[PDB]
């Protein structure tokens, strides 16, 4: 039974690549037993990774990823963990896998917000691998049917596409719509993203088979979109559901501002 990594790191110095593949397999087998010996010899792993002519530079990237994951240098651990590629089995329940997944989520949320506030001309590109792997978190959550958690991560990541997909494919459309509305009103602050999210729920509400026009009108008042609510009132008038129209207008009077009501009246007048 193994006693240290000295033999393996000594094997690492050898020239023929196939022996390097065997030693990297052994290192991945045991890096959670004695990380220290390879921690000081991680420079070999970096120079292994940066080589284009290597046929398995991804395995070197993964080995260095685990090494830095031990080292606490979680920034370089995340870098060389993204460098691991598809060998990073998301479905795995490894502690290294779990923590790098969590740090991927954190980095993706940070990058997403820092790109969302910034204008279009200065958006720093998100790495493709982190976007895909976080998409694999949304897919895994949907398969595990933890739709609320996927909604929350989508809101963290400013991903309105993932949010819209999560609401659409969710089993309970009205309940999830209500939960999202409550969260959006009571817990999130950024105003422009708030307007975009409210437009998302408005679109989902109107595309819903029996539109919850009370909630749609509430979201429109919150959005200050008099033209849309005027068109919706016209649609209700032509659609004969007069009780909807009456309750909606009473709600607008109780809730919407005087400017909003005057503008709606003018739109209804014209």
């Amino acid at each position: 039974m193994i006693t240290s990594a000295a033999g393996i790191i000594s094997l690492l110095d050898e020239d023929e690549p196939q022996l390097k593949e065997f030693a990297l397999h052994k290192l991945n087998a045991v890096v959670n037993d004695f990380w220290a010996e390879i921690s000081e010899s991680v420079d070999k792993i970096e120079v292994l990774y940066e080589d284009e002519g290597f046929r398995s530079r991804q395995f070197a990237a993964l080995v260095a990823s685990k090494v830095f994951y031990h080292l606490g240098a979680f920034e370089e651990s995340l870098n060389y963990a993204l460098g691991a590629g598809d060998l990073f089995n998301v479905n795995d329940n490894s502690e290294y896998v779990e923590t790098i997944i969590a740090k991927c989520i954190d980095h993706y949320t940070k990058q997403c917000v820092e790109n969302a506030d910034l204008p279009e001309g200065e958006k720093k590109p998100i790495d493709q691998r982190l976007e895909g792997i976080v998409n694999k978190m949304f897919q895994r959550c949907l398969d595990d049917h933890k739709y609320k958690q996927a909604i929350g991560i989508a809101l963290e990541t400013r991903r309105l596409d993932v949010f819209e997909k999560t609401i659409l494919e969710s089993n309970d459309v009205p309940g999830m719509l209500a939960y999202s509305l409550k969260l959006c009103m009571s817990l999130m602050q950024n105003k422009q993203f708030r307007n975009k999210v409210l437009r998302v729920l408005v679109k989902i509400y109107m595309n819903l088979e029996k539109p919850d026009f009370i909630n749609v009108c509430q979201c429109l008042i919150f959005l200050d979109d008099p033209q849309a609510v005027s068109d919706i009132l016209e649609k209700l008038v032509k659609e004969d559901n007069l009780l909807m129209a009456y309750q909606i207008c009473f709600d607008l009077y109780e809730s919407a501002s005087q400017q909003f009501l005057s503008s709606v009246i003018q739109n209804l007048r014209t």
């Binding site: 958690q149 909604i151 969260l183």
Partner: protein
Amino acid sequence: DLYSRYKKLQQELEFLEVQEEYIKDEQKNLKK
């Protein structure tokens, strides 16, 4: 549930920070 609890935790921490800075400033002024 889980995400709402996380958001409430972060909001409570932020409010705690506001109270912390306020109390420090008031401590300085009260010392003066």
